[PDB]
Amino acid sequence: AVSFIGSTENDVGPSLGSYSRNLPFVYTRNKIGYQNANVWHISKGFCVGLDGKVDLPVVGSLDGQSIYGLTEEVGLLIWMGDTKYSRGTAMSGNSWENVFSGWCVGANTASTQGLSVRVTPVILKRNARYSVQKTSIGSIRMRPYNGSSAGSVQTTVNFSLNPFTLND
Ligand SMILES: CO[C@@H]1O[C@H](CO)[C@@H](O)[C@H](O)[C@H]1NC(C)=O
């Protein structure tokens, strides 16, 4: 079986966080991110993976992944995937992308499916500080497989980037 145990709306990074450091200039570890190991409760042979989607406009790329725009001065590199940050999938484009191939819980056991979102600020153009307001990032949806079904359970959660400031 499967049930939604997370939050529909999720903020990425601490509110009003401040970060210090040619163009494009990339900054922040997992500081600006959201992580939750328990978003869906799964059991009895349920198989599930994750799809991720970024709604921000694409304004450039770096080493194979999109640079998403926030302001004409600030951009973002984004990763979505399974719970642990190191397993994040670098995001490109604005379509739903497979960000976690998935796994199946035991035939007679219960566990959970989590996720993580991480971003790193990028200075596209310069002015001394750069501020960013609360902005919608995108979403992540569970992807059942092997015949498993989501039934009427909530499959998608959304993410918003909390406001932050970048200091040169
Ligand atoms: C079995 O552990 C579970 O594996 C899944 C797939 O890697 C993770 O999404 C999930 O968060 C994790 N749950 C916990 C409590 O750690």
Swiss-Prot record:
Identify the domain of life.
Bacteria
Where does it live in the cell?
A: Fimbrium
Annotated a carbohydrate binding lies at A37, N38, D82, T83, S111, T112, Q113, G114
Give me the ranges of the annotated region Receptor-binding lectin domain. Answer: 1-168
Q: Tell me the disulfide pairings in this chain.
A: C47-C104
Q: Which family would the database say this protein is a member of?
A: Belongs to the fimbrial protein family.
This chain's function reads: Essential fimbrial adhesion factor that mediates binding to N-acetylglucosamine-containing receptors in the host intestinal microvilli, leading to colonization of the intestinal tissue, and diarrhea or septicemia. Also confers adhesiveness to laminin and basement membranes.
What name appears for this protein in its UniProt entry? F17a-G fimbrial adhesin
